[PDB]
RNA sequence: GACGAGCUACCCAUGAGCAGUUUAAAAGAACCAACUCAUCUAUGUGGCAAAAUAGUGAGAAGACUUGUAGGUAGAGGUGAAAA
RNA sequence: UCGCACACGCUUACAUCAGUAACUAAUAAUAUACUGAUAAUUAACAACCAAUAAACCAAAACAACACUAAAACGUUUAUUAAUUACAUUGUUAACCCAACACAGGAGUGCACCAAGGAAAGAUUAAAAGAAGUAAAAGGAACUCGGCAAACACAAACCCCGCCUG
């Protein structure tokens, strides 16, 4: 599961610098994270997917901690939501219903089957494209309303947007809300994160 | 014409079952063993080869730096009961 | 000190014959060198 | 139209290096050899040397030093930014 | 006093013999760095080699552990397949980059000695210069400034910049 990440340092395939002040930091091992969550398919069956959270771990590529998930027939890594506890059952279902059943902050559900007003994160842009939104620590979205075949989401940037109903999203808020309260204290830590001093 | 023998030249003393030769650079030890066994009809226990790079010397008339042809030397260990002595 | 720090690998890789063949301009370099009658196309 | 990042500037990949002493847990502080710099003075001024030597001084677990393998060039690159 | 080994490199400088009017090492002595001819060590040393497909999480600091910067190199299972893989190159020669036999230059491991170099032309004891040593009494009276310099660092007060760079 752990993969070796290649640091560009502002260098593209040509070798030119498209971004100033990036490099000189510690290396990183990219951990595979599932932004899909809509794919039970590997079990070769339409049925739902049950999960168990083994442990919560830190990630190099993101400020948000990553949670270790095991179904016992498989092991996948996700992004740890706030209030997440070790040994919690995580239910995932792509089924559509009007029942509107409340789920734990670790679960994931489509925007349509999910009640309005609940704080959510990891929202996908287009179906099957994975979640492109709110992967950062401490943030979260909120469902404003439902219009036609779409659902209106309010992003942490306060911008009101329209996201497709079939897009799956995880309820709750992302953990590590104190990340923004972290004081660097020196340029050295910035050099450790891979951020070079910018005179531009 | 590819090989020749040298005895009184080397300062190292190995009179017992050790003979020195000058060989071509391309020739492997095995082919040397087989050739020395079949042509001269003598047993060969071992072969140790090394390459001697040629020295260089200039020419004052044309003002041109030249180099002597490179060489390769071999040391053969024959069967027990033989002694190589030559001057 | 000096501007020169001798390396054989870098010299053979960068200034080598194969490098001259890999580019058309290098072929033009070898071209003008043979046109000038150079005894050595590479140092 | 081409040659140049074996100097140097930055960066990528892969390795290595940085005694000892006081100390409450502290790769934590301060001093001080290597190493990395060139504060002041003197000498040297067709020289030992087209960037030096001697005394002295700074950093010296850090934004540190360094080997090797690579990338970025003139209607530009790079630049903790001095034209 | 500071140097022996591993290199990247450097292309017989080196070892033996012989000869040095002449050139070559600013001369002689001579020669590891001149001419001419003739010697130039191995390997179990260093370079050069199986294709793939699966399994696995919980960094390194003589580290159960902890911390942070979220971690050089690691192993196992299965399938296919390979031959003389008793081979091929190199080392061990002398050191090299700066026009020079140039007080300047660099990577790695461990000694500081039983390793290594001798300020290897000689006189004169002037002025003057460079480095160094000492001084009666005064103790900054010098000077742009306690620069320099032997002895030491006790105390005072400001401007600017936080600071480590």
Q: What is the DSSP string of A122-176?
A: --BSSTTS-B-S--STT--EEEEEEETTEEEEE-TT--EEEEETT-EEEES-BS-
Residue recorded with tokens 């509107």 = A100
CATH of domain A94-174: 2.30.30.30
Protein CB footprint (7 Å) on chain D nucleotides:
2-7, 10-14, 62-64, 68-72, 77-81
Q: What is residue A15's three-state secondary structure?
A: coil
Supply the CATH number for residue C35's domain. Answer: 1.10.287.3980
Q: Say if residue A147 is exposed, middle or buried (CB neighbours under 10 Å; 0-12, 13-18, 19+).
A: exposed
Q: How was this structure determined?
A: cryo-EM
CA dihedral A182, A184, A189, A194 (to 10 degrees): 70
Question: Which residue pairs, CB below 8 angstroms and at least 24 apart, start in A149-158?
Answer: A151/A111, A151/A112, A153/A111, A153/A120, A153/A123
Instruction: Specify the length of chain A in residues.
Output: 200
CATH of domain A1-93: 2.40.50.140
Q: CA B26, CA B19: separation in Å to the nearest integer?
A: 20
Binding residues of A: 58-59, 62
Sign of the dihedral through C-alpha A82, A88, A93, A97 = negative
The domain tally of chain C equals 1
* CATH 2.30.30.30 placement within chain A: 94-174
> In Å, what is the separation between the CA of B67 and the C1' of E32?
23
Q: Please, which chains are in contact with B (at least 3 CB pairs closer than 8 A)?
A: none
Q: Please, which chains are in contact with A (at least 3 CB pairs closer than 8 A)?
A: none
* CATH 2.40.50.140 placement within chain A: 1-93
- The whole domain housing C3 covers 1-43
Binding residues of A for Mg(2+): 58-59, 62
Closest CA to A120 of A170, A65, A79, A54: A170
């Amino acid at each position: 599961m752990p993969v070796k990440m290649r640091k560009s340092g502002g260098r593209n395939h040509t070798g030119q610098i498209q971004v100033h002040g990036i490099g000189g930091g510690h290396k990183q091992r990219y951990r595979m994270i599932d932004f899909l969550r809509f794919r039970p398919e590997h079990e070769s069956k339409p049925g739902p997917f049950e999960e168990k959270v083994i442990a919560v771990r830190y990630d190099p590529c993101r400020s948000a901690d990553i949670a270790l998930v095991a179904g016992g027939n498989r092991k996948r890594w996700i992004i740890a939501t706030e209030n997440m506890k070790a040994g919690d059952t995580v239910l995932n279902s792509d089924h559509i219903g009007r029942m509107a059943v409340a789920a734990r902050e670790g679960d994931a559900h489509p925007l349509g089957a999910l009640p309005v007003g609940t704080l959510i994160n990891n929202v996908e842009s287009e179906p099957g494209r994975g979640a492109q939104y709110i992967r950062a620590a401490g943030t979260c979205g909120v469902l404003l309303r439902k219009v036609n075949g779409t659902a209106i989401i309010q992003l942490p940037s306060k911008r009101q947007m329209q996201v497709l109903e079939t897009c799956i999203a995880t309820v709750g808020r992302v953990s590590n809300v104190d990340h923004n309260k972290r004081v660097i204290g020196k340029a050295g830590r910035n050099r450790w994160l891979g951020k070079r001093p910018n005179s531009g | 014409x590819x090989x020749x023998x040298x005895x009184x030249x080397x300062x190292x003393x190995x009179p017992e079952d050790t003979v020195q030769f000058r060989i071509p650079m391309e020739m492997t030890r095995v082919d040397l063993r087989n050739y020395l066994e079949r042509i001269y009809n003598v047993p060969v226990a071992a072969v140790r080869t090394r390459v001697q790079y040629g020295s260089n010397r200039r020419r004052d008339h044309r003002n041109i730096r030249i180099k002597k042809p490179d060489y390769k030397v071999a040391y053969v260990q024959l069967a027990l009961g033989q002694x190589x002595x030559x001057x | 000190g000096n501007e020169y720090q001798p390396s054989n690998i870098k010299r053979k890789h960068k200034h080598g014959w194969v490098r001259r063949l890999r580019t058309p301009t290098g072929v033009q370099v070898i071209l003008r060198r043979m046109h000038k009658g150079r005894k050595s196309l590479s140092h």
